Amino acid sequence: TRKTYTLTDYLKNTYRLKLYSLRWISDHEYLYKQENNILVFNAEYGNSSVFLENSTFDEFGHSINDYSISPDGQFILLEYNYVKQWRHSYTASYDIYDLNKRQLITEERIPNNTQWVTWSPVGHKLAYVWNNDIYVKIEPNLPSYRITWTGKEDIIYNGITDWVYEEEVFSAYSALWWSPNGTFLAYAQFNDTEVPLIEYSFYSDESLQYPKTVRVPYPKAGAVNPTVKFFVVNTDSLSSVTNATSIQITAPASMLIGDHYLCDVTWATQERISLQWLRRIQNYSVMDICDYDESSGRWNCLVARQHIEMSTTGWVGRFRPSEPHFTLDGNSFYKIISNEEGYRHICYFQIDKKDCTFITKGTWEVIGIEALTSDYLYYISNEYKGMPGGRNLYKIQLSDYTKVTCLSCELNPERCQYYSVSFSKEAKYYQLRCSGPGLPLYTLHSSVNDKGLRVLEDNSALDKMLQNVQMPSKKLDFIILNETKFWYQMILPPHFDKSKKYPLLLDVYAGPCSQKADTVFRLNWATYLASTENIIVASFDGRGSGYQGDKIMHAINRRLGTFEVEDQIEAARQFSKMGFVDNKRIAIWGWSYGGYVTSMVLGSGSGVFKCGIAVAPVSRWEYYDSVYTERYMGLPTPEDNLDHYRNSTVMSRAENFKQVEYLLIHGTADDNVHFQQSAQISKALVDVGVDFQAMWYTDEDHGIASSTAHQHIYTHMSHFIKQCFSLP
Amino acid sequence: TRKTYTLTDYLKNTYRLKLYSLRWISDHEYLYKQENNILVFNAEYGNSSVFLENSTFDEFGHSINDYSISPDGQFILLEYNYVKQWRHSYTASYDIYDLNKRQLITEERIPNNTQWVTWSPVGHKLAYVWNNDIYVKIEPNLPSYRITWTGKEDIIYNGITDWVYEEEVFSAYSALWWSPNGTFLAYAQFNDTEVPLIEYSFYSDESLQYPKTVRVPYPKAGAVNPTVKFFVVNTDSLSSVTNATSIQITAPASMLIGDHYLCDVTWATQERISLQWLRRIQNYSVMDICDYDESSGRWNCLVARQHIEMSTTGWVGRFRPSEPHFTLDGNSFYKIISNEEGYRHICYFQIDKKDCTFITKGTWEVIGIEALTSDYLYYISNEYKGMPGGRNLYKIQLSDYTKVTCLSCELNPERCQYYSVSFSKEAKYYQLRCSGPGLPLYTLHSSVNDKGLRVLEDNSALDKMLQNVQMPSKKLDFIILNETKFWYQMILPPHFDKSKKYPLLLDVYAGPCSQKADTVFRLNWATYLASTENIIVASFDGRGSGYQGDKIMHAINRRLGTFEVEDQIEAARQFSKMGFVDNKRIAIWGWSYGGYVTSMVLGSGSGVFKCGIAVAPVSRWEYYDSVYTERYMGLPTPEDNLDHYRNSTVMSRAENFKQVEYLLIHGTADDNVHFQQSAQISKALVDVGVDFQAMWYTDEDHGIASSTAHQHIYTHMSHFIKQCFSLP
Numbered sequence A, B: 001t002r003k004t005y006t007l008t009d010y011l012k013n014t015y016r017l018k019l020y021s022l023r024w025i026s027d028h029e030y031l032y033k034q035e036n037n038i039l040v041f042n043a044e045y046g047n048s049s050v051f052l053e054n055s056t057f058d059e060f061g062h063s064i065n066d067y068s069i070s071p072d073g074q075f076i077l078l079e080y081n082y083v084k085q086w087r088h089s090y091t092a093s094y095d096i097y098d099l100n101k102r103q104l105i106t107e108e109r110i111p112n113n114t115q116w117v118t119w120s121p122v123g124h125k126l127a128y129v130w131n132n133d134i135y136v137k138i139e140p141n142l143p144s145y146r147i148t149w150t151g152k153e154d155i156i157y158n159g160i161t162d163w164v165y166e167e168e169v170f171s172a173y174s175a176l177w178w179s180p181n182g183t184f185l186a187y188a189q190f191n192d193t194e195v196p197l198i199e200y201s202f203y204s205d206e207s208l209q210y211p212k213t214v215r216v217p218y219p220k221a222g223a224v225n226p227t228v229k230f231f232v233v234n235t236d237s238l239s240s241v242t243n244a245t246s247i248q249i250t251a252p253a254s255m256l257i258g259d260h261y262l263c264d265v266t267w268a269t270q271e272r273i274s275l276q277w278l279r280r281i282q283n284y285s286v287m288d289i290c291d292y293d294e295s296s297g298r299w300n301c302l303v304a305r306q307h308i309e310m311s312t313t314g315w316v317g318r319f320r321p322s323e324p325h326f327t328l329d330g331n332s333f334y335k336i337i338s339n340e341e342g343y344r345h346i347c348y349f350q351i352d353k354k355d356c357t358f359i360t361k362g363t364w365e366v367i368g369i370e371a372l373t374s375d376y377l378y379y380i381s382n383e384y385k386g387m388p389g390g391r392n393l394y395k396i397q398l399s400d401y402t403k404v405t406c407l408s409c410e411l412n413p414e415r416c417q418y419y420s421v422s423f424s425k426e427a428k429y430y431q432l433r434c435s436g437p438g439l440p441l442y443t444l445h446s447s448v449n450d451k452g453l454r455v456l457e458d459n460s461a462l463d464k465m466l467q468n469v470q471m472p473s474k475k476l477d478f479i480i481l482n483e484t485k486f487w488y489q490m491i492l493p494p495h496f497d498k499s500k501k502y503p504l505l506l507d508v509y510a511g512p513c514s515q516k517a518d519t520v521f522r523l524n525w526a527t528y529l530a531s532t533e534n535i536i537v538a539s540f541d542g543r544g545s546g547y548q549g550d551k552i553m554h555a556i557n558r559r560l561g562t563f564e565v566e567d568q569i570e571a572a573r574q575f576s577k578m579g580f581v582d583n584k585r586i587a588i589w590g591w592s593y594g595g596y597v598t599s600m601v602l603g604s605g606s607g608v609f610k611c612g613i614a615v616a617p618v619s620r621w622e623y624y625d626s627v628y629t630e631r632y633m634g635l636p637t638p639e640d641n642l643d644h645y646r647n648s649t650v651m652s653r654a655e656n657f658k659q660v661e662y663l664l665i666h667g668t669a670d671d672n673v674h675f676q677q678s679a680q681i682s683k684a685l686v687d688v689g690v691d692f693q694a695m696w697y698t699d700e701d702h703g704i705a706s707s708t709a710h711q712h713i714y715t716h717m718s719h720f721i722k723q724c725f726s727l728p
């Protein structure tokens, strides 16, 4: 009898997925770390040399967290003293190593506690943010030029995002954008002066006598938002003038009438930048296209070049308006937008014409535009086999839109249905990354003939390991509700028997534009539950889920906590009808949005679920941030949508938790979904006399991802599920 | 078959203890509220009259929290808009009703948000504190005189205590002391300028969008403490034109050399006040005796009237140096102090003589001095039958100390072994309050020949109800450890069978000077556990416990988390060897100090306990307040006691929790034992990979006493204990 995949296997990572993370440094060369040596690979032939020997920084005196080679290959940026902040933000120390001289640079050093640093895209200029101000070094050993003087901790942010712009808009800490050859540096400035603070305790090591109060500018739904300004400085003039002018590009009049956001910055050419702005009511966006005027040194945005993107059924974009991809000359661009049918497709614009031309169409969606050459556009879509949860690379001929080639579809169709891609600098080569339904497979290809060059990593080591393990299987399929297909997946125990009744766990996220049913291979908690505990772990994509058109995605518009919640309940009813599910043993669990949905389902009075686990749930939309919440809910005012805000809380359903077993879990240092949200759930439950299980995680944030806490939470949850299902 | 005492009975107060709370107004009369009417009773005959009808305030408009009748019976102070702060502190609104003209005073009213108010001991003057300043009204309808002008929230406290003085020194919010005829008002001023703040979140009602941060000046062990000054003002020479002059009485030079406390204020006569000061190192205290100088208007404390009280084995006093009881002329006084054997007895002092004379002696302790006449001193002691957990009233003839008469011992020896007493103004009458081992019994007596006048309340209604319930019994006994007896109690199930094996729960407090084994009748959680669940609930008084001399009490000096923890394990080990205890089912629980000891026990590696519950435990002495902690521990500095502070933490024992079941519970708004303490426990257990059970109570303090939270906590603990013991 082969062993099963156990909780320890999962928690100790005994069965390891191999990756192949390369970094393109030119059109035909990439860097790859092998045995802590940095190797440089010729893409065409596969041969390598040592770029930087593992022993180079033995006497550095610090553990190096990451590195970054300048585009011209002359310098390497060494990152150490890494200190995490939020999802993307952190601070660090930096040294620069001169690759030609083979010397560490010791003068005019990047200061300690630096917030962000980046090379120019050409050469070896550096821009960094320190104490909320921007600085530029033209040469690594020379003095910095200060760009901004207004930086103020928790108040003014120059070239870095505040909490909400980092999480909800840019998915980055950085708010700086070099122009393509590095002449200009564009940046955003955020003003949080009147933004209210979330305040919570951080306990730290036990040696800390008094807990620390962490205070973060965080706008909750309907609260005062940060304001934003945009500037461009000419870095080439820095060594010529005492104090180079940052030229402001003001938002259009249509944004200035009320609260708004900067949502996209994309350079088109050396002297043309595009900016997208979004109204606080997130169904109206404007793209300005701005040209440098040589004789005035100003930036002007012609109204003839201004592009409106709006929605009548929901918000604009999946999570924000999509980025443009400009042709080399900067006179036209490609952009994913929702078509007349509500499906997201590639539209082609001339910069000074308002109507675009759709170059793709159909009842499927383009996920992203990956590369653009003079002859071809490359994109990922879920077109293949009508499967919204698959992903493949396509190539469309720019001079003939009827010529569309799927580059990945038929490579290994049994093993590989979910792809991402990595193109070299001028798209001469691409790495394909297959992530499922079989073991991940990494391969290299030449764009000139789309021929496979070689297999990079095929995970044969893991395959060999998994032969001696009773592994679960995955079913991906659909049910039909109101003449619409809704997709689900099931992690099924080994030797699955259709004539037996299995306990079922519903794994839920269900946020807007989410997808929990897909072709990705995962080794996770569900793997253990199916493999060792013989539990079916199911997930379902109902109304509000993504990549299936706006009719489904915008169904929850202004109504979170309704259809996406009901559809999970209905999914569980449908899984019962299938005949291999023990109706007396159906559980539900989720993290984040999934914790909200789980709690809403457990408080619905449906009778379907015996028990459930919510980890770091939202409990009331007014507690969550403005940008995310208002996108789907509008404003919590009597004029707008307050009634539904107040109607969609977990707390109002407290009495119904008498029918279920509930485990509530939250990290105390969660800056994202505040511990407040679960403090309010537990209080409401105490107030109606409902017994439940609770667990706080001291100083853990939204990820509860520290090594010991991760192991602890999954161990705690396993006991709870096993208890609920009467499993020994 | 009759019912048992259930969890619902405990939580819903089905079986109510009747009380008889009287208020002496003279040597011959008392007030007693009956049916919301206030009656006045003649003590000699038992006849009464209505003092104030219930319906007098029918149209008042506010719900009245409490009342306070002026000593002359002319006025009644009406308390409403009560808002709790800490254990003793609150604010309220106040109105004064004139009892003779049957009218609310509407002029010059006491302000809203008043922090403290008190009648003078004679007549009807008022002193109140509002916004941290002291005010005086000579007549209820006249303008107040402002006494102090320095009051400042969280910084300067006039006539009220700060957090630590309220909790640990005075057990009161008031820091005001009227002289016996109301001429003078003495008061303390506290300065918290450099005291660090504990900060924690308060979530409030669901409607509060952002949690509030509560900030309280709170000195943890070793931190900067509040400073204190003491003043006396003449309320007979106040002026509308001139600001009042307060005369400062400075601490003795022996105190001024370093950090110190004011720990007692007691008026001796109309013109003589005593104060006791205590060093931050709490084994040295000094009493000053100060006389008013009529020609100079100053208060002089003659060095010849200083009395030093120190300890070579521990700290001074049980929780602080004891209060003196001055004779009529104030030329001599009686004070409980530790004798040369280390037993607390009454010493007789002359004001200007160094040596006092002990008037009581033996291997038992005086609990308190209760009344004093020229012929007798009346006191409570645990002398009778050599039982440290019994209490009886005695009088001692002041002219012949060999003549000691027990006044309560033989009244009802089977029902009544635990008394407290309330004397009338000149000790002409006394009320005895028996609280166990039988049902509470309240009686009135006259001092002249100790006649038992009448039974006030015998709880015969409860007795009749309890006849149809299967009530548990209590065993009080002792075990021997190193030739010393230590007492324990067991709450035994109904129909106890010493040939059956019962699970056992060890209920623990074990703080210094605590007593958990006594003759008191209680209806609590243990009653339910024994009556319904057939669990023996044991408590044990080991080293560090009170009322048995300093050899026992001071055993844990500088050494908390040692002998008192060991002695609980040893008691349980001994119980586990008794024929009627199931050694496979022994549990431990406690709250506060008992939560600390429970955790230290479960982390001891003893193997004796299967499971345990800690509620709001201390986890590290450096997190608790200075006044309590340093009393027993000294300072957490390398030159003093840091090493033991560091080795007496719960966190260091985390690994030893692997073999026990542990439930950790804490209120998030605990201002006393900060949530921090439990937050650090859970983190330590997570860090070593130990699974446990947790519950936080949102916005609950140290008492977890809100109605809903109280029902929830005991419900949750009941399930935990029953699960642990395999009980259905």
Ligand SMILES: C[C@@H]1c2nc(C(F)(F)F)nn2CCN1C(=O)C[C@H](N)Cc1cc(F)c(F)cc1F
Residues within 6 Å of the ligand: A167, A168, A171, A318, A319, A511, A513, A592, A593, A617, A618, A628, A672, A673, A702
């Ligand atoms: C993962 C998702 C996302 N997906 C994508 C896509 F489509 F590009 F893949 N872009 N983004 C932008 C970032 N995303 C977010 O949903 C951000 C959001 N703050 C996540 C979140 C939602 C919650 F309801 C919550 F309670 C906690 C959270 F962290």
Ligand SMILES: C[C@@H]1c2nc(C(F)(F)F)nn2CCN1C(=O)C[C@H](N)Cc1cc(F)c(F)cc1F
Residues within 6 Å of the ligand: B167, B168, B171, B318, B319, B511, B513, B592, B593, B617, B618, B628, B672, B673, B702
């Ligand atoms: C109850 C006790 C006490 N008992 C007495 C006595 F002897 F008069 F009964 N006086 N005092 C003075 C006040 N007392 C205290 O112990 C105060 C103390 N802060 C209580 C306490 C101790 C802890 F270890 C703790 F963790 C939390 C607490 F609230």
Ligand SMILES: *[C@@H]1O[C@H](CO)[C@@H](O[C@@H]2O[C@H](CO)[C@@H](O)[C@H](O)[C@H]2NC(C)=O)[C@H](O)[C@H]1NC(C)=O
Residues within 6 Å of the ligand: A040, A041, A042, A045, A047, A048, A049
């Ligand atoms: C991979 O091999 C190629 C081709 O052999 C190397 O390119 C050059 O090879 C010729 C001799 O065969 C010489 O001109 C030089 O020795 C090489 N020049 C370069 C580009 O370095 C190439 O070096 C190899 N790539 C790596 C990264 O090792």
Ligand SMILES: *[C@@H]1O[C@H](CO)[C@@H](O[C@@H]2O[C@H](CO)[C@@H](O)[C@H](O)[C@H]2NC(C)=O)[C@H](O)[C@H]1NC(C)=O
Residues within 6 Å of the ligand: A150, A156, A191, A192, A193, A194
């Ligand atoms: C950030 O925004 C705030 C507005 O909240 C600006 O602060 C105001 O500045 C003016 C000067 O123009 C003052 O007269 C006001 O008193 C300020 N108001 C507040 C609320 O402080 C601030 O100038 C902005 N900062 C930057 C660098 O743009």
Ligand SMILES: *[C@@H]1O[C@H](CO)[C@@H](O[C@@H]2O[C@H](CO)[C@@H](O)[C@H](O)[C@H]2NC(C)=O)[C@H](O)[C@H]1NC(C)=O
Residues within 6 Å of the ligand: A149, A150, A243
């Ligand atoms: C460089 O130029 C900027 C912009 O002109 C200066 O910033 C101004 O500084 C003055 C006085 O310190 C303030 O009154 C303005 O409000 C600032 N404006 C902005 C946009 O920040 C900056 O101080 C200059 N630096 C130097 C070294 O002269």
Ligand SMILES: *[C@@H]1O[C@H](CO)[C@@H](O[C@@H]2O[C@H](CO)[C@@H](O)[C@H](O)[C@H]2NC(C)=O)[C@H](O)[C@H]1NC(C)=O
Residues within 6 Å of the ligand: A181, A182, A183, A234, A236, A270, A271, A292
């Ligand atoms: C990168 O692009 C910038 C912007 O076009 C170039 O700067 C211009 O250079 C031209 C010469 O072709 C001059 O006419 C302008 O005066 C420059 N404009 C500005 C705003 O500086 C720059 O030379 C390019 N860099 C490189 C190295 O090619």
Ligand SMILES: *[C@@H]1O[C@H](CO)[C@@H](O[C@@H]2O[C@H](CO)[C@@H](O)[C@H](O)[C@H]2NC(C)=O)[C@H](O)[C@H]1NC(C)=O
Residues within 6 Å of the ligand: B093, B109, B110, B111, B112
């Ligand atoms: C305490 O509060 C009461 C009630 O607010 C005060 O009496 C008045 O109350 C009404 C509303 O109840 C208000 O319109 C007035 O502002 C209050 N003032 C007066 C003088 O009528 C009362 O004054 C307050 N007491 C103190 C000492 O401020």
Ligand SMILES: *[C@@H]1O[C@H](CO)[C@@H](O[C@@H]2O[C@H](CO)[C@@H](O)[C@H](O)[C@H]2NC(C)=O)[C@H](O)[C@H]1NC(C)=O
Residues within 6 Å of the ligand: B181, B182, B183, B236, B270, B271, B292, B294
């Ligand atoms: C309360 O005691 C005070 C202090 O002894 C009395 O005040 C004194 O009264 C006598 C009058 O016989 C004067 O000689 C003193 O000058 C007063 N001394 C002070 C300190 O003011 C007061 O008479 C007593 N009050 C009552 C109500 O009995």
Ligand SMILES: *[C@@H]1O[C@H](CO)[C@@H](O[C@@H]2O[C@H](CO)[C@@H](O)[C@H](O)[C@H]2NC(C)=O)[C@H](O)[C@H]1NC(C)=O
Residues within 6 Å of the ligand: B281, B283, B284, B310, B311, B312, B313, B634, B639, B640, B641
């Ligand atoms: C009160 O207690 C302190 C601390 O135990 C005693 O001061 C001395 O301090 C250190 C320990 O911190 C040691 O060197 C001595 O053991 C302590 N003194 C002795 C016994 O010599 C202090 O003596 C105590 N005071 C009284 C009144 O006994």
Ligand SMILES: *[C@@H]1O[C@H](CO)[C@@H](O[C@H]2O[C@H](CO)[C@@H](O)[C@H](O)[C@H]2NC(C)=O)[C@H](O)[C@H]1NC(C)=O
Residues within 6 Å of the ligand: B040, B041, B042, B045, B047, B048, B049
């Ligand atoms: C209790 O009884 C006494 C005596 O029977 C009551 O009578 C005394 O006080 C009354 C006025 O307050 C008058 O009736 C008499 O002055 C006086 N009589 C005596 C006994 O000398 C007394 O009021 C009663 N006490 C109460 C509180 O009602």
Ligand SMILES: *[C@@H]1O[C@H](CO)[C@@H](O[C@H]2O[C@H](CO)[C@@H](O)[C@H](O)[C@H]2NC(C)=O)[C@H](O)[C@H]1NC(C)=O
Residues within 6 Å of the ligand: B150, B156, B191, B192, B193, B194
């Ligand atoms: C309360 O105590 C503080 C000291 O903590 C007093 O202010 C003093 O301390 C300051 C340092 O924080 C010094 O700068 C001041 O010079 C010093 N003042 C005096 C009078 O010495 C403060 O006055 C105290 N308040 C009261 C009303 O007693």
Ligand SMILES: *[C@@H]1O[C@H](CO)[C@@H](O)[C@H](O)[C@H]1NC(C)=O
Residues within 6 Å of the ligand: A035, A036, A037, A054, A055
């Ligand atoms: C580089 O150092 C590593 C140590 O981590 C060593 O294992 C490796 O063999 C070294 N590289 C080579 C080419 O030997």
Ligand SMILES: *[C@@H]1O[C@H](CO)[C@@H](O)[C@H](O)[C@H]1NC(C)=O
Residues within 6 Å of the ligand: A093, A109, A110, A111, A112
């Ligand atoms: C960073 O901090 C270290 C330690 O304090 C210091 O020695 C070093 O000089 C700092 N580096 C810079 C660039 O200031």
Ligand SMILES: *[C@@H]1O[C@H](CO)[C@@H](O)[C@H](O)[C@H]1NC(C)=O
Residues within 6 Å of the ligand: A281, A283, A284, A310, A311, A312, A313, A634
């Ligand atoms: C944006 O949303 C609001 C609220 O639903 C609506 O009233 C308005 O018409 C919308 N605007 C557009 C461009 O559809």
Ligand SMILES: *[C@@H]1O[C@H](CO)[C@@H](O)[C@H](O)[C@H]1NC(C)=O
Residues within 6 Å of the ligand: B149, B241, B242, B243
């Ligand atoms: C009393 O003292 C305060 C503050 O010191 C002052 O403002 C007030 O005017 C004084 N009153 C008189 C009458 O002296």
Ligand code: NA
Residues within 6 Å of the ligand: B452, B453, B454, B455
């Ligand atoms: Na009698």
